[PDB]
Each structure stands twice: as structure tokens, then as C-alpha cells.
């Protein structure tokens, strides 16, 4: 289940980008 | 310009979703 | 309800600081 | 100088809290 989040901001998208990569890292630490 | 973030997380996407809507409101206040 | 956080990051804290302010604005609009 | 955050939301602080803790982990990795 994917969700498309269209944004017209490089700064905003940058945040969600760093937050998304950081969340994925936590998963690797668990398993 | 214009960046689409395809997140497969209801929780994570929920955060960026609320952050995107809240960020758009600030832009309206400016000007 | 009021918790405190000890962050020594001007940029990081600045981000969460903007969210808190923008969050309070959403309550005024309600919707 | 340190910057305290006074949020009136357990959920909100959780986000900013998980971000600060998750962002600090990245430093340990470095590149």
C-alpha cells in the first residue's frame, strides 16, 4: 500500500526524505 | 521543483501528511 | 500535558520548534 | 546553548523525540 505525496517544496520534501531514511535504519537495527 | 514521496507507511506518511498541510497554511499567512 | 526535551541543536530544535508553533495555529482554525 | 521544548502533546513530543534520538544514531555511523 503506497501513497503518493505530491509537494511543491524542496525543503519540505527534504525533511520527509531524511525522516524516511532514518526510520528505515531503525528497522535494520531491530532485525 | 516538485518532488513526489512514495512512502509505504501509514504512520510515517501520516506525519509527513500533517506536516505538509500545516506547512501550506504558513505560506498563506505570508505575503 | 507538558513534556520537556533537552536538545542542543539549533537547526534540529528549530525544526521541531516550527512544528509546535504551526501545530498551535491549526487549533485556531479547527479543520 | 541548549534549547528546551515545551510541547502540550504526548504524540507530538514522541515525533520530535524519536527524530532527535533517531538523528543522533546517524552520527554514530558517519560517512
UniProtKB/Swiss-Prot annotation, chains A, B, C, D:
Post-translational modification: Deacetylation by SIRT2 impairs its ability to induce transcription activation in a AKT-dependent manner.
Region entry Interaction with HIPK2, spans: 1-31
Phenotype when changing residue 3 to L: In a sporadic cancer; somatic mutation
Modification sites for Omega-N-methylarginine: 8
Resulting phenotype, residue 10 to H: In a sporadic cancer; somatic mutation
Covalent link Glycyl lysine isopeptide (Lys-Gly) (interchain with G-Cter in ubiquitin), residues: 26
Impact after mutating residue 5 to R: In sporadic cancers; somatic mutation
Record note on what altering residue 19 to P does: In LFS; germline mutation and in a sporadic cancer; somatic mutation; impaired ability to tetramerize and undergo liquid-liquid phase separation
Function summary: Multifunctional transcription factor that induces cell cycle arrest, DNA repair or apoptosis upon binding to its target DNA sequence. Acts as a tumor suppressor in many tumor types; induces growth arrest or apoptosis depending on the physiological circumstances and cell type. Negatively regulates cell division by controlling expression of a set of genes required for this process. One of the activated genes is an inhibitor of cyclin-dependent kinases. Apoptosis induction seems to be mediated either by stimulation of BAX and FAS antigen expression, or by repression of Bcl-2 expression.
Protein name: Cellular tumor antigen p53
Gene symbol of the encoding locus: TP53
Entire-sequence positions represented here: 326 to 356 of 393
Amino acid at each position: 500500500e503506497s501513497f503518493g505525496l505530491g509537494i511543491r517544496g524542496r525543503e519540505r520534501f527534504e525533511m520527509f526524505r531524511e525522516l524516511n531514511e532514518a526510520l528505515e535504519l531503525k528497522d535494520a537495527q531491530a532485525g
